[PDB]
C-alpha cells in the first residue's frame, strides 16, 4: 500500500487539467524531473524559495490557484515556465494540505493576503525537515506520472 | 607494486576554464565551475578522464585498442580500465592584488593555502605507497612551504603588504624556497591560511554575464540572462594518472604521454575557453 | 588598509599600466562613495593625494554638504580622466598572448583566422558589467587578468551568427554554429586590445531628458559620465575550427558586421569598428 | 459621488430582475475588451443564496464568491436588505485587473440575512451547462454590457472567461 | 443542543458586561491546559469598531479578527445586531486545534452595520502594553475562566500566548 | 537563539517588506536584490556596501526610520523610492551584520551617523573581511528569491 | 537669547501641565503644516522614565527618544532639577528639518537623576492603542498651536506621523 | 555586588589625584594583553570639559569622548558632583571587545554641569605630539596598573595606540 501515488494520481490529475497550452504541461515535466533531485540535494527550504520566486504569486495567478483546489475547472494562465512553476507550488501545497501538515483554511487565508504569505513560509519552514522526508515518494511519483503521460521535445 | 605507472601532472589554463557542476538551487550564478569537498574549484576525475579520452581517441587513431586497454572501452568493456585519474586538485589560481612598497609591480598574483599542498602531498605520499615512484623533490619543496603552515608566506617576492580581490587585507611575509619550476614567469607565489584563502581563491573566479537577444525586437529575451564563473587562465591544478602493469600501459606511458600536451577541458569550448597545457612532473620537477 | 586607499589614486597616477585596474576602481569606488568623509582631516595629511585640492576649494562657503556635493561631482570627473590619461595599453602581452595561443592551436590541427579591428568612434563593450560601475553607474567589459578592456567571445559569436542568420536563413546558421542537439562548428576566442594610437579609455556622458518623462513638468537633465573605450584602438581574436566549408561564411560576415555596431548604443554611432586585417591559415 | 453594485454570477439567474441602472455613470468598475472580463471582484467569507441567490455572511475563508462590479443603485427598491460600504479602491479583492480605480468607491453588495435556523453547509459549485452560460450572458452582459455583439464580437471567450474564473461556493439550502 | 458565543479580544475595556453566560454547558471550544490558549477563532473578513466595540465587516480577506469560544447568549439585550448562526464545526477558521467539536454549534457575534458615511481604511494593531494585558486577563481571561489561579498558575505563560497569538485589524475610524 | 540563512532573511524581508509604503519602493527593492548580490561579488562587499550607503542618502532623517526599524515593527522608510529601496537593502545587509554578531548595533549606527567613525568603520570590515564575505552572499541569495516572489515585476 | 524647552511623546500621561509659555512670541521649532510635524528633536543616549516622565540618561546610544521644542522656561521656580545648556541653533539633531533658525537658543531639557540603584534596562515603545493618539493629538498640539482644530481639513493625517515616528525608550521603572 | 570607574584619556595633566582604589576586587573592563588595550570603552553625546576637566554632555550624537574604565570609587569627596549611575553590563558601548563581564555594574564618571553659559562649538581633537603620552602613561598606566614593567616590553604598541585609538571633541574653551 502506497497511498503518496493516489496522492499523486488527484493532484496530477488536477494540474493536468488545469493547464491548457501544451507547452505549459512539457514545462511542468521538465519541472517535475528537475524540482525533485534539487529538493533531495539542497533541501526542501532552498527549493521552496527558487520556485516560490520563479512562480510569480500575483493575486491573480494566486487565486486561480486557490479555485483549483475545489473546482477542476481553474485554469493556470501565464507564460509556460511561469505556470510550470506555480503547478509545481500547487503539486506541493496539495500535499501539504492532505497529510494534515498544514490547514487548509490557514493556507486559503494566506494566498489571499499578501501580509500572510509570509507567515506561510515561516510555518513551512518551521516544517521543513518533516515535509522534507515525507514528500520524497510523492514527488517522485509525480515525476514519474510527468514523464509517463505529456511527451517531451 | 599496485600500479606500473605513476605520473602527475599539473594542469595550466592556456584559455579561461569552465568545468561545470550544473545549476544547483543553492548556488547563485546558474553556472558555477566544479567545486570540491572544502569549497575550492576542482576538476573531476571524471571530467579529466572523458576530455582526455575523447581527445586522445582522436588523435593517435592508430592505437585506440592501447588507449581502449588503458581508459577503457567504450563498448562492451570484458575488463576495468588499466588507468586512474584522480580530481585535480586546484594548486595556484591567478588572483587579483594592489599593493604599495614594491619596485616590480604585479597586477595578478599566485594564491594557495595550506590546504590545497597538504592534498598534493597527500596524493604524493599515497602514490609513492602504491607505486615504485617517489617523487622527492616535489615532497621536499611542498613539507619546505608546509612547515610554515598557519601564517600567510609569499614565495618569490618582497611583498609584506597587500590587498587581494579587493576585500582581502593580507600581511605576508618571505620564505626562501621559490619553485621557479611551476611558477616559471616569476609571479610571487602567495600562500595564504585556510580561513582566509578560501574566500580569496572563491573570489578569484571570473563571473560573466551572458544573454540572449530576441532577434525580432533585438533586445534580451525574457528570461535569458545568466551568469558563468570561470576559472582565470593560467590556473593550476594537481593530478596524477596512475596505470596498472600491462604491455599497454607502457606503450601509453612512453608514447601516448610523451606527446599528449594541449587538450580542451570542460564546456563553453566555442566562446574559446577549454584549452589547457599538461606538464608530467616527470619532466617539469 | 586604510592608507592603500588613500593612496590609491597616487598608485594610479604611478604605475598606470601595471596595477590592477578593476580593484584600483574598486578601492577608489570607497572614497568616491565616503569623499566627504576622506574630507574631515583624514586625507593622511599627504602632498601628492588628490584628495589636497579639495580642501583648496571653496564651491559654496554657504552650505557645506552642498559644497561636499559639488566637490563629488568634480572628483568624479577627475577620476575619469585620470583612468583615461594614465591608464594606457601595452598590447605586447598580448601579442605574446595570441601568437603563443596560434601556435597551441597549430599543435591541435586547426584552421586558424586571426582578425584585427579597430574601433572607429568610442565604443561600449559591456556596459551593464562591473568596472567602474560603483563610481560611474558604467561598466566596461574588463578582464582583470589581462587587466585589459575586452569583447567577449561570446557577443563576437552572437553578432556573426545574427548576421548569418539574416542573410543564409537559420537553417544554415545552426550548420555552422550548432542548435540544442548538434555543437557549434566555428570557436571563437575573447578580443583583446593589441595597439593604439593614444589613450585606451576616455570619459564621455549621457544626459537623458525626456526619458520616461510625463510632460516638459518632468524634464530634468540627469548627466552620466562614464568611460568608453577610445577611438583608433585596435583589438585583435582567433577564429578556429577543423571543418574547411565555413570558412567561407566567417570570411563573409566579417567585414560586414563591424561596419554595424558591435557593442552597446550603435543605434546613435558608438560602438563602430573597422576589419583592421584578416589572416587564414590553413591546417596543412 | 460615484456608486457601484455588486453583480454576482452564480449558475442561479436571479438577474433577469435585478438592476435598474445598467452604467448611468460615465464608467465602469468591471471591463470587457477582447481579452475578457476585467477587474472582476472576489468576496471571501460569504456564500451565495441560490434561492434568489445573495451573499449570505459564513466565516469560512474558504467560501468565496467572484462577481462583476457595475455603477448603479439597487432598484430603489431595496435599502433594508443590502450592505453598502466605501473603500479606497485598493481595499477590493481584484482579480484581472487591468487599469486604476478612483481611490473611493461606495460599494452597495446583494446581502441576506445570517438566518440563524439551520446549519449554513455549502459546497463548491462551478459554471457549466452551456445553456447556463448562454442565458448568464444573455441577462447581464447583453443589458449591463450592450457592448456586446455590437463592439464585442468574439463573445467564445468572454464565456469561457466564465466558464472558467468565475466560479463559487453555494448553500444549496 | 450545544450553542456558543464568540467574544472579540481587542485592546479595549469595553468587555466587563454585556453578557449572560458564564458556563453553561461542560466544556468549552477555547482551552488553556498548561500550555496557553488553543482553538482560537478566527473570523478573517471583519473589522473592529471599538468606540462601542463590534465587529464591522469589510471585504478585505486581510482584514481578520482573533477571539475565544464560550458557550452562552449575550445579556439578552440583543437579537437585533448580532450575527448569529450555525456552524457544522468545520467551517470555523481555528488555530492550534487541540480538542475536536461535535459536528455543530451555534455563535453570537458583536457587530454592527457598515457605517455606509465614511470610507473603512483600516489599521492593524497589535495587543502590546502589557498593562493591557492583566487588564484583559482580569476583564475577561478571569470572569469565564475561574480555571485560573485555581488549576493555572502559570500566568505569564498565558501572558506570552496573549501577546503573539491575539491580534486585530483595527477601524481607525 | 541561532536563525540560518533562509530563516534570517525571511525575518529581515518582513520588515523590510512592511517598511516599504508605496509600491514604487517595493519594486524598486525587488531589482536592488536582484542586482546587488552579483554587484558584491564582482566588486568586493566592502565597495558594495559603501556604494549601497552612498546611494540610500541617509540624509540625517532617513537614517533615522532606518534606526528605528531596528526597534519596532511600526517604522517606515520615506523618500525616493529609488533611494529608499538602497535604505532597504543597507538594512538587510545591517540585519545582518547584526544579528550574526560580527560587528556591533551601537557602532554600525555610529559609522552611519557621523563621518570620522565611518573610516573606523572601513578598518573594521577590512578585518572582518573573511567573516562576512563566507556565507553573506547566501542570506542575500534567499533575500532576492523571497523579492522576486512576493513582489510583482514592474 | 530664545529659550525653548524640549518636551517629550510617551505612551504617559506625564505632561499634564508641565507648561507655562506656548509662544510668547512669534517663534517655535516645530511647524505643521498639513505635512506632518517638522524639525523633530531626537535626543539620543538617553531614556524616558515614565515615574514622573523626564529624560533618565544612559551611557548607551542605542537609546533614544524624540519630541518638540516649545517656547518658554519651564516653571521659573526650579532648574536645580532640569538641565540646561547652550547650543548654537545648529546641533540640535531635528529629523524632518524644514527651517534654519538664528545660530542662538537655549534648551531646556527636562532631566531627571540617573537614580544608581538598579540596571535602568529599556524597552523600545512605539506609541499605538488609538485612544492614545486621540489623546497626545490633544496633550499638547492643540493648546501650544492654537490653529490645530481650527484650521485643519488634514487632521487625521498629521496624526499617522504622531502615531508612527515617534518611537522611544522606556526603562521599565 | 562591586564597583567601577571610568578615566577617560584627556589632554590635560589631569590623573594627579582622581581615584582612590587601583584594583580593590578581581577583575576589571579594560585589558592590557600582548595586543594592546582590549574592551576601552566610549561615551558619545558628551564633551570634555578640561575647565576642571570633566564630561559635559550634549546633545548631539557625535561628542564621543574615549576612555578606559577599573575598580573605584572616585575620590571620598564627590559622588555629589559626579553623575553616578548603573548599568545592566550591556549597555556599555565598548571598543575592541574581547570578552564578557559580570552582567551588572555601577560607575562612575567625571561630570561638569551642561554648561548653559556660552554655545558650545566643540571640535575634533588628536591626541599626538608623543611628549604628551609620555604624560599619560605616567597618568594612567602605572596609577592604576603597576602591571606595565612587571608584564610589558610591549610598549611598541601600546604607545601607538594610545597616539591613535583615543578620541574626544572637545570645547577647547
Known sequence: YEEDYKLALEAFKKVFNALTHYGA???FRSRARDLVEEIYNSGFIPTFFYIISKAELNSDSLDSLISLFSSDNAILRGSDENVSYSAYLFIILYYLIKRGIIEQKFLIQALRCEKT?????????????????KIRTYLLAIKRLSEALIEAR | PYYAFAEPFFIHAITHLHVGSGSSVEEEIALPF???????????????????????LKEFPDKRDVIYKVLGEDENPEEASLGTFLDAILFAIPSRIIEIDSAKPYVWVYVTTYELLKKVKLYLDSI?????????????????????????????????????????????????????????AGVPLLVLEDSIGREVINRSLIRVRRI??????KVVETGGLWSEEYVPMKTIFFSVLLGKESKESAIFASCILRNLRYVILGGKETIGKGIVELRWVKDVI | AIDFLVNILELIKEKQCNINLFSAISLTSIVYNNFGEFLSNNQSYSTNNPLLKYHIIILNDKNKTKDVEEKRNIFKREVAELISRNFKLDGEKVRNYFDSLKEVLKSLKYTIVDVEITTRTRALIGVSTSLGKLIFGSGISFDPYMNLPYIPASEIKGIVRSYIEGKLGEQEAEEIFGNEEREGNVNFTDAYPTRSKDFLFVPDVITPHYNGKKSEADAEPRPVIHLTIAPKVTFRFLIYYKREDVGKPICDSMPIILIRGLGARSSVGYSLFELRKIEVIKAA | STQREYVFIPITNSITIDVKITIGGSDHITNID????????????????????????????????????????????????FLTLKLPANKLYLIRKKGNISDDLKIYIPYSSPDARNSMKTKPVSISDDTIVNNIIKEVFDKIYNITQKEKVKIEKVKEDIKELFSYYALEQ
Open chain 2, 128 to 184: 609513492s605507497q602504491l607505486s615504485n615512484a617517489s617523487f622527492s623533490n616535489l615532497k621536499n619543496k611542498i613539507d619546505t612551504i608546509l612547515a610554515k603552515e598557519g601564517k600567510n608566506i609569499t614565495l618569490d617576492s618582497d611583498l609584506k603588504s597587500a590587498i587581494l580581490n579587493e576585500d582581502f587585507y593580507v600581511e605576508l611575509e618571505a620564505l626562501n624556497n621559490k619553485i621557479p619550476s611551476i611558477i616559471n
Open chain 1, 117 to 133: 504569505r509570509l507567515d506561510l513560509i515561516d510555518k513551512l519552514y518551521n516544517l521543513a525537515p518533516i515535509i522534507s522526508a
Open chain 2, 212 to 217: 540572449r537577444i530576441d532577434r525580432d525586437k
Open chain 2, 34 to 56: 566544479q567545486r570540491d569537498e572544502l569549497g575550492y574549484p576542482t576538476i573531476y576525475a571524471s571530467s579529466l578522464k572523458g576530455a582526455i579520452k575523447s581527445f586522445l
Open chain 1, 25 to 27: 504541461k512539457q514545462a
Open chain 4, 34 to 81: 477582447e481579452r475578457g472580463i476585467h477587474n472582476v471582484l472576489v468576496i471571501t467569507g460569504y456564500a451565495v443564496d441560490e434561492k434568489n441567490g445573495r451573499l449570505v455572511p459564513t466565516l469560512d475563508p474558504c467560501d468565496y464568491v467572484k462577481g462583476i462590479l457595475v455603477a448603479g443603485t439597487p432598484q430603489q427598491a431595496q435599502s433594508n436588505d
